[PDB]
Amino acid sequence: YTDPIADYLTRVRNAVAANHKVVEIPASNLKKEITKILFDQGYILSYKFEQNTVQGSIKIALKYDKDTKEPVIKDIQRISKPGLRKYAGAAKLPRILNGLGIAIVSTSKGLMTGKQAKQLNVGGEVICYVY
């Protein structure tokens, strides 16, 4: 591969576009952290860490409304790329969706959100953003 994070986001985006229910992505520490952040923020219904593989799987259940489905994930994209890494201290964090979207920022403490890191006054590297 070239970017497992980009693949992890692309699988979710394609499944949302195709109106699926579950995804069976491969697993890693960074993907597990991103899944935990997304479930805490409320963009996915549930996630299961499936064993019995040399690497392990992540089964994520996508969330839609009970009427007029309107998937809550409208645009999930990357900011840092393996061809251009973009870092920023705790003053240049993005303004994704005018404060209505989340921006995952890998900080020196751990993986946090753009709004959860500005309170701690730590910088880090912006990984991705979700509307």
CB of 53 or CB of 100, closer to RNA: 53
Nearest approach, Cβ of 94 to RNA (angstroms)? 11
Candidate ranges 44-52, 62-70, 84-92, 94-102; the one touching RNA (CB under 7 A) = 84-92
Other C-beta atoms closer than 10 Å to the C-beta of 116 total 18
The answer to whether residues 69 and 18 touch, using CB atoms and an 8 Å cutoff, is no
Kindly list the strands in the beta sheet with 44-50, ordered across the sheet, starting from the edge strand earlier in the chain.
22-26, 57-62, 44-50
**H-only helix segments in the chain:** 4-18, 29-41, 114-118
87 DSSP assignment:
B
Residues 39-78 vs RNA: string with x where CB under 7 A?
---------------xx---------------------xx
Contact footprint for RNA (CB under 7 A): 1-4, 6-7, 9-11, 13-15, 17-18, 20, 26, 28-30, 33, 54-55, 77-78, 81-85, 87-91, 106-111, 121-125
